[PDB]
């Protein structure tokens, strides 16, 4: 089946990515899919369904779903926006009830979807060329609330039950490294790899989507929720008509929509199922998987250099057979630092006590360039804040991002003002003064005392700074001492940031003891819609 069918009415809009590049993206994402399912696929699927049986999901109220709407979610064509929804206005609510009643009445009529080009910031790099704008398909604000009513409890309960430890989103960055490192140590002869699927969303066949539904149907579901899942599957999930920003009929989808509630959850389940089955086809001994949507890391017992090269080809053959071919073929790695997943890679450093600590790190180029864009054109989303949270132990986040933004915030007297940030699915509102507490909860106390980084990691940061015209780490060290000083003078929460966050900047280091606030770390108390 053709992933996409196009009419000719072009993708109209509302370095960066424009709608002018969309034509190239369309070509990459449009293709025929050929699925050849085998007995392993069926066996894994029965195992998964059995684990889903145990889940019981609650149907959310019309009002309950409104308070989970992100404040920046696109407005409805029916005259009401995200604000109107979370304020529980009669226009929003009465219209949402009609959408809900329509899902329970209509079982065939496809739900209309909007095709858009994602405006992302990438780096102006003269190996490879400019990437074309990613495509984003989504239903109306109204349908998006009903999706949450019928499936919010499912998606935020089910994957963890079906996949257990293989489910990526359950982990904090510290917990993810803990998992990866333990699984690598657990093997007597470790050999891992990361499998990148070319255009994941486009490889998701109508059967794949119906297979996910078959899994959601294994929970205890309210009759209404059960019907709504059935209707949302056939009217939205399995495909539908596309409509550009203007209002013209753009084309027809027969794959995954990125702007749906099930996207993340479903992708994880689909990728897990395919990979898990392909592990049996390739006869990969003592397997460990870590699935983060379309992202997949496999750790196992090596069976020899030649044998592993062969087993990896068998894995790929099997994945391709399940309509999930690779971008570039996976190579077996015998060092965990070389395996790249969720754009990041495990690195090592030493804390105060001299103990070797593992941490996740990525190439600073994109985070830095994105932050430099944020600095210029004003945005409601702060990639830098996310990056400071997610990559807190890294040399780059600590020395550049933290130094830069804290000096900016100190100067604007905005340290006490909350900021909206998106970490993968979830949207949070965090005050920078609260960061130490969060960083400790997500990474550990070692996050503030790290030193003795890998020479290569140090050079990756160094060379990257030169390339972007960013002042050297020596400049940053100096700048940090001034921020640290100005923070400690302020006292209270401001002084905690100075003490913990900026300890690396001083010659005369302080004894960093566990934070009095992070002792009773709640989390999800910063949570403002998702997931
Ligand atoms: O799509 C989702 N669900 C659909 C399928 C059903 C979904 C999406 C996100 C999500 N979460 C909760 C767990 N965490 S979390 O880290 O505990 C955290 C908690 C609070 C916080 O904000 C604060 F603290 F400020 F409140 C900030 C972080 C975040 C995360 O994305 N984790 C994965 C991950 C972890 C490490 C990685 O590695 C590297 F670091 F390299 F990226 C890469 C991915 C956010 N949960 N579910
Ligand atoms: O050799 C020595 O001993 C010292 C050398 C030295 C060299 C250059 C400076 N530069 C500066 O002071 C100024 N810019 C900066 O001090 C600066 C700060 C952050 C910058 C960033 C990012 C850093 C991460 C958060 C967002 C801002 C970028 N660029 C930056 C420049 C360079 C830039 O202009 N743009 C980009 C573009 C892409 C990526 C990064 C950048 C301030 C006004 C005049 C220029 C300072 C010291």
Residue by residue, DSSP assigns 219-237 as SB--HHHHHHHHHHIIIII
CA 314 to chain centre: 28
Strand partners, 299: 192, 288
Torsion angle of the four alpha carbons 177, 161, 256, 96, in this order, in degrees rounded to the nearest 10: -120
- Lookup: tokens for 435: 């960061």
Q: Positive or negative, the Cα torsion across 150, 154, 155, 156?
A: positive
Q: Which atom of ligand 1 is nearest to the CA of 527?
A: 26
Report d(CA 124, CA 265) in Å as an integer: 33
Q: Positive or negative, the Cα torsion across 517, 523, 529, 531?
A: positive
Report d(CA 237, CA 201) in Å as an integer: 12
Closest-approaching ligand to the CA atom of 374: 2
Number of H helices, E strands in the chain: 22, 13
- Lookup: tokens for 246: 């203007």
* Alpha carbon distances (Å) from 234 to 76, 146, 202: 22, 15, 17
- Lookup: tokens for 35: 């699925």
Which one, of 364, 519, 336, lies nearest residue 457 by Cα? Answer: 364
- Residue 371 beta carbon below 6 angstroms from any ligand 2 atom: yes
Contact at 8 Å (CB) between 158 and 219?
yes
Resolution in A: 3.2
Contact at 8 Å (CB) between 449 and 351?
yes
Half-sphere exposure of 528 (CA within 13 A, CB side): 15
Report d(CA 181, CA 173) in Å as an integer: 12
Which one, of 350, 274, 317, lies nearest residue 504 by Cα? Answer: 350
Closest-approaching ligand to the CA atom of 175: 1
- Say if residue 220 carries a ligand binding annotation: no
Report d(CA 511, CA 311) in Å as an integer: 50
Which one, of 139, 386, 313, lies nearest residue 241 by Cα? Answer: 139
| Coil/strand/helix, residue 40 | helix
Report d(CA 284, CA 314) in Å as an integer: 10
Strands 344-350 and 356-361: antiparallel
164-204+262-342 has which fold?
Alpha-Beta Plaits (3.30.70)
Ligand 1: residue of 170, 173, 381 to mutate (most ligand atoms within 8 A of CB) is 173
CA 285 to chain centre: 29
- Which secondary structure element, helix H or strand E, spans residue 99, and what is its range? helix 90-105
Residue in the block written with tokens 């070692």: 446
Report d(CA 134, CA 21) in Å as an integer: 9
For residue 368, the CA-to-ligand 1 centroid distance in Å is 20
For residue 372, the CA-to-ligand 2 centroid distance in Å is 9
| Coil/strand/helix, residue 288 | strand
- Residue 372 beta carbon below 6 angstroms from any ligand 2 atom: yes
Per DSSP, 291 falls in state E
| Coil/strand/helix, residue 525 | coil
- Lookup: tokens for 204: 């998701």
| Coil/strand/helix, residue 413 | coil
- Which secondary structure element, helix H or strand E, spans residue 113, and what is its range? strand 113-117
Residue in the block written with tokens 């959310």: 60
What angle is formed at CA 111 by the lines to CA 105 and CA 113, rounded to 5 degrees? Answer: 160
- Say if residue 294 carries a ligand binding annotation: yes
Phi then psi dihedrals of residue 347, to 5 deg: -130, 165
| Coil/strand/helix, residue 493 | helix
Sequence spans of domains, the chain = 1-32+110-139+239-254, 33-109+140-163+205-238+255-261, 164-204+262-342, 343-531
Length of the chain in residues, anyone? 531
Q: Which atom of ligand 1 is nearest to the CA of 155?
A: 6
Strand partners, 173: none
Strand partners, 136: 116
Contact at 8 Å (CB) between 253 and 137?
yes
Which one, of 365, 400, 373, lies nearest residue 483 by Cα? Answer: 400
Contact at 8 Å (CB) between 168 and 268?
yes
Contact at 8 Å (CB) between 415 and 433?
yes
| Coil/strand/helix, residue 16 | strand
- Residue 471 beta carbon below 6 angstroms from any ligand 2 atom: yes
**What experiment produced this structure?**
X-ray
Whether residue 172 is preceded by a cis peptide bond, meaning omega within 30 degrees of 0, is no
Contact at 8 Å (CB) between 187 and 300?
yes
Report d(CA 115, CA 123) in Å as an integer: 25
Q: Which atom of ligand 2 is nearest to the CA of 365?
A: 39
For residue 400, the CA-to-ligand 2 centroid distance in Å is 10
């Amino acid at each position: 089946s053709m992933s996409y069918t196009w009419t000719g009415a072009l993708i109209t809009p509302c370095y960066a990515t424009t709608s002018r590049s969309a034509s190239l993206r369309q070509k990459k994402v449009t293709f025929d899919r050929l699925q050849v399912l085998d007995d392993h696929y069926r066996d894994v699927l029965k195992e998964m369904k059995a684990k889903a049986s145990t889940v019981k999901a609650k149907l959310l109220s019309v009002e309950e779903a409104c308070k989970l709407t992100p404040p920046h979610s696109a407005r409805s064509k029916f005259g009401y926006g995200a604000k109107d929804v979370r304020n529980l206005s009669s226009k929003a609510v009465n219209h949402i009830r009609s959408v809900w009643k329509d899902l329970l009445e209509d079982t065939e009529t496809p739900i209309d979807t909007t095709i858009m080009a994602k405006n992302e910031v990438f780096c102006v790099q003269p190996k490879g060329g400019r990437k074309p704008a990613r495509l984003i398909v989504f239903p109306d604000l109204g349908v998006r609330v009903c999706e949450k009513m019928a499936l919010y409890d499912v998606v935020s309960t089910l994957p963890q039950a079906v996949m257990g430890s293989s489910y990526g989103f359950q982990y904090s960055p510290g917990q993810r490294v803990e998992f990866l490192v333990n699984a690598w140590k657990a093997k007597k002869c470790p050999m891992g790899f990361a499998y990148d699927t070319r255009c994941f969303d486009s490889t998701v066949t109508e059967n794949d989507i119906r297979v996910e539904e078959s899994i959601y149907q294994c929970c205890d579901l309210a009759p209404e929720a059960r019907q709504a899942i059935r209707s949302l599957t056939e009217r939205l999930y399995i495909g539908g008509p596309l409509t550009n920003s203007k209002g013209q009929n753009c084309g027809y989808r027969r794959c995954r929509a990125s702007g749906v509630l099930t996207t993340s959850c479903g992708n994880t389940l689909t990728c897990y199922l395919k990979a898990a089955a392909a592990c049996r086809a390739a006869k990969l001994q003592d397997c460990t998987m870590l699935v983060c949507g379309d992202d997949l890391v496999v750790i196992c017992e090596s069976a020899g250099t030649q044998e592993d090269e062969a087993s990896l080809r068998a894995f790929t053959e099997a994945m391709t057979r399940y309509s999930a071919p690779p971008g570039d073929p996976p190579k077996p790695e015998y060092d965990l630092e070389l395996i790249t997943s969720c754009s990041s890679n495990v690195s090592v450093a030493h804390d105060a006590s001299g103990k070797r600590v593992y941490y996740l790190t990525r190439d600073p180029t994109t985070p830095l360039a994105r932050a430099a864009w944020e600095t210029a054109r004003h945005t409601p989303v702060n990639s830098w804040l996310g990056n400071i949270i997610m990559y807190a132990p890294t040399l780059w986040a600590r020395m550049i991002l933290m130094t830069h933004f804290f000096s900016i915030l100190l100067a604007q007297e905005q340290l006490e003002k909350a900021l909206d940030c998106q970490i993968y699915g979830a949207c949070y509102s965090i005050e920078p003064l609260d960061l130490p507490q969060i960083i400790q909860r997500l990474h550990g106390l070692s996050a503030f005392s790290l030193h003795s980084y890998s020479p290569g990691e140090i050079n990756r940061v160094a060379s990257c700074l030169r390339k972007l015209g960013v002042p050297p780490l020596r400049v940053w060290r100096h700048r940090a001492r001034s921020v640290r000083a100005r923070l400690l003078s302020q006292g209270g929460r401001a002084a905690t940031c100075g003490k913990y966050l900026f300890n690396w900047a001083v010659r005369t280091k302080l004894k960093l003891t566990p934070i009095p606030a992070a002792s009773q770390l709640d989390l999800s108390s910063w949570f403002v819609a998702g997931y």
